[PDB]
């Protein structure tokens, strides 16, 4: 889930951008370096916001480009294990369903879709419960729980995320309403 992180960092500013002010040059270098990458501890680097303080450059032998201590805010989205997720199903597959949780997509296994048995109907390439007569189709809006996060590399595409859907308080909003109706009925009896 989205958050703002203030990070201190050293920026290698090449001689070709010596003309512009240090703030914009540091902003650009951080856009090229951090933006669009996955970090193991904070999530997905989405957008560099702004730089507050930039230090004077240090010339080190070998390159001639200036190195500056910088302070900046990065808008980063962090998935957290065992939390709640609001999203829509981007697509479905026989092994699992893809749930849009933000910058990256999550996977809901068919064994975690329903307590009831499910079958992958190929007529519309959609899921359908055996006895509940419920169904999932592309574009449906559902609520699920994140249960597993895996991070291979800094590429956001490769890292995968798996969710759960059977547990109480989750499901399609219509099913949530039906469960609320059942709760009201059992409270009234």
């Amino acid at each position: 889930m989205y958050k703002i992180v203030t990070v201190k960092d050293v920026v290698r500013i090449p001689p070709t951008m010596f003309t512009m002010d240090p703030k914009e040059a540091a902003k650009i270098i951080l856009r090229e370096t951090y933006e669009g990458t996955y970090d193991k501890d904070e999530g997905v680097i989405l957008s560099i916001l702004e730089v507050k303080d930039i230090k004077d450059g240090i010339i080190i032998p070998g390159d001639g480009a200036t190195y500056h201590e910088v302070v900046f805010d990065v808008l980063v989205w962090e998935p957290k294990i065992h939390e709640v997720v609001e999203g829509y199903v981007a697509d479905v597959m026989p092994f699992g369903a893809f749930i849009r949780i933000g910058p990256i997509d999550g996977l809901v296994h068919i064994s975690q879709l329903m307590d009831d048995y499910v079958v992958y109907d190929e007529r519309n390439k959609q899921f359908v419960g055996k006895e509940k007569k419920y169904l999932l189709k592309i574009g449906d809006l559902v609520r699920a729980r994140i249960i597993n996060i895996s991070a291979k590399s800094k590429v956001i595409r490769e890292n995968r995320i798996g969710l759960t859907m059977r547990q109480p308080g989750l499901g399609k909003f219509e099913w949530i309403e039906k469960e609320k109706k059942k709760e009201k009925e059992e409270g009234k009896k």
Binding site: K3, V5, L46, E86, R100, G169
Partner: protein, 116 residues
Amino acid sequence: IGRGKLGEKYITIAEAKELLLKRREEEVKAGIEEPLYYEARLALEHAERFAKLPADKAKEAVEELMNAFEWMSDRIACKIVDIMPEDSMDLRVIFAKEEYQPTQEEMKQILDILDK
């Protein structure tokens, strides 16, 4: 001197919305064909799917939720504002994996603060 973390704070979906639209307008004025990269625009689509509360009023809601209770953290208020719970079941699910479970009266108070 390498990378280091100086601060950390949690934000709502509406803030990410308005910030990414600021980014979008900056890049569009710059003339970029795709103002935000592909992951960024997927995140923007997700944000605009569930940005129920206007950004400034979202800030006011988070600050009110901070003022009301002390056991909750910033991320708790952020995800509460993102969810927009309507009854005890939604907040029970929200706090189900959280170490703390508030009284249902505080749950009514959370719904009231959401209403205002």
